[PDB]
Design an enzyme around this catalytic site. Structure first.
Site, short mmCIF file in Angstrom:
data_model
loop_
_atom_site.label_atom_id
_atom_site.label_comp_id
_atom_site.label_asym_id
_atom_site.label_seq_id
_atom_site.Cartn_x
_atom_site.Cartn_y
_atom_site.Cartn_z
N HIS A 13 24.57 80.42 41.75
CA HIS A 13 25.78 78.97 41.90
C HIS A 13 25.35 77.26 40.94
CE1 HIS A 13 27.07 82.32 44.73
NE2 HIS A 13 25.70 82.60 44.84
N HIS B 110 20.39 69.35 43.34
CA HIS B 110 21.24 70.33 42.84
C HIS B 110 22.04 69.34 42.60
CE1 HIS B 110 23.23 71.58 46.90
NE2 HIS B 110 23.78 71.38 45.96
N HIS C 208 26.90 69.97 41.08
CA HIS C 208 28.64 69.88 41.04
C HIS C 208 28.81 69.43 39.84
CE1 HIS C 208 27.77 72.48 44.60
NE2 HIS C 208 27.26 71.11 45.36
N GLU D 258 32.84 67.12 44.76
CA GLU D 258 33.26 68.24 45.51
C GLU D 258 34.13 66.87 46.52
OE1 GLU D 258 29.59 70.39 47.13
OE2 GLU D 258 31.08 72.03 46.40
N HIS E 188 23.76 66.55 45.01
CA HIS E 188 23.62 66.67 46.71
C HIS E 188 21.63 66.24 46.79
CE1 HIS E 188 28.00 68.41 46.71
NE2 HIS E 188 27.82 66.66 46.97
N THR F 231 28.42 72.40 51.57
CA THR F 231 29.44 73.43 51.00
C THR F 231 30.20 74.20 49.98
OG1 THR F 231 29.04 72.24 48.59
CG2 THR F 231 29.99 71.01 50.31
N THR F 232 28.42 74.95 50.32
CA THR F 232 28.45 76.56 49.60
C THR F 232 28.34 77.50 51.00
OG1 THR F 232 25.57 76.88 49.60
CG2 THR F 232 27.92 75.51 47.83
ZN LIG Z 1 25.85 70.71 47.04
#
Ligand SMILES: [Zn+2]
Length: 257
Positions: free
Chosen positions: A61, A91, A93, A103, A116, A195-196
């Site tokens: 992901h 990580h 996004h 996000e 993040h 957020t996951t």
């Molecule tokens: Zn994140």
């Protein structure tokens, strides 16, 4: 399983993770005119001088750059936080196009990507216990826009060919996350969630107002990663972001005027 595709993306997550429709979900839109300056917030303390990066992992992901969190080596303190939070991983996004990827949004503006840096509260002993607590995590969020290159990011994007597919990892020692920070530490803060999935409501979010600039070539390399495993049909790892969720009964506070 959950992901970011048409059939398993964020609008589907609630079926396995009902907290997806909860009272303190992330990310959110940051309405800059409604956020209130809170003069009782302290300056953020980012102490990354003794950071020990270990490994970089494509988890299907995103990719995580992981740190030794068995001692207080890289910690976040101050700001809205009580106590000491240890860096465990960072990580990103990102989008398929420069007009999307983040996000959090700022007055509905989407950035090309969002970093993040994930930290857990040392009073809970380990990350697994921390995520079960309302104050268990502190995540430092940093927006990326496309412009000049970020020198401090280049070592990350250059190792990505070696972790193209899900489940691949590579040694990633001696990486200094200070090289990913903007000049200013002015921030917005609010209580939210992962957020996951599992979308746990355990995060104090600290989102920096100043984005970092990365080059188009740098973002192109992010977009060459794969969600799939080796030997499986190629699905590019792009648009691995959850959209803004309802603010509900929350106030976003600003550290600055
Ligand atoms: Zn994140």
């Amino acid at each position: 399983h959950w992901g970011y595709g048409k059939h398993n993306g964020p609008e589907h997550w609630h079926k396995d993770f009902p907290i997806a429709k909860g009272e303190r979900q992330s990310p959110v839109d940051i309405d800059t005119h409604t956020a209130k300056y809170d003069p009782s917030l302290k300056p953020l303390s980012v102490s990354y001088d003794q950071a020990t990066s270990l490994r970089i992992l494509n988890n299907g992901h995103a990719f995580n750059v992981e740190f030794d969190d068995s001692q207080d080596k890289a910690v976040l303190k101050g700001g809205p936080l009580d106590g000491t939070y240890r860096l465990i991983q960072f990580h990103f996004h990102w989008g398929s196009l420069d007009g999307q990827g983040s996000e959090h949004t700022v007055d509905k503006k989407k950035y090309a990507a969002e970093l993040h840096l994930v930290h857990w509260n040392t009073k809970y002993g380990d990350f697994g216990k921390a995520v079960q607590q309302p104050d268990g995590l502190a995540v430092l969020g940093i927006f990326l826009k496309v412009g000049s290159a970020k020198p401090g990011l280049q070592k990350v994007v250059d190792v990505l060919d070696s972790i193209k597919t899900k489940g691949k990892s590579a040694d990633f020692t001696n990486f200094d996350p200070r090289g990913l920070l903007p000049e200013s530490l002015d921030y917005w803060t609010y209580p939210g969630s992962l957020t996951t999935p599992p979308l746990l409501e355990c995060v104090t979010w600290i989102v920096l107002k100043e984005p970092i600039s990365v080059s188009s070539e740098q973002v192109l390399k992010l977009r060459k990663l794969n969600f799939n495993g080796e030997g499986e049909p190629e699905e590019l790892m792009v648009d691995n972001w959850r959209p803004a969720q309802p603010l509900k009964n929350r106030q976003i506070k600003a550290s600055f005027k």
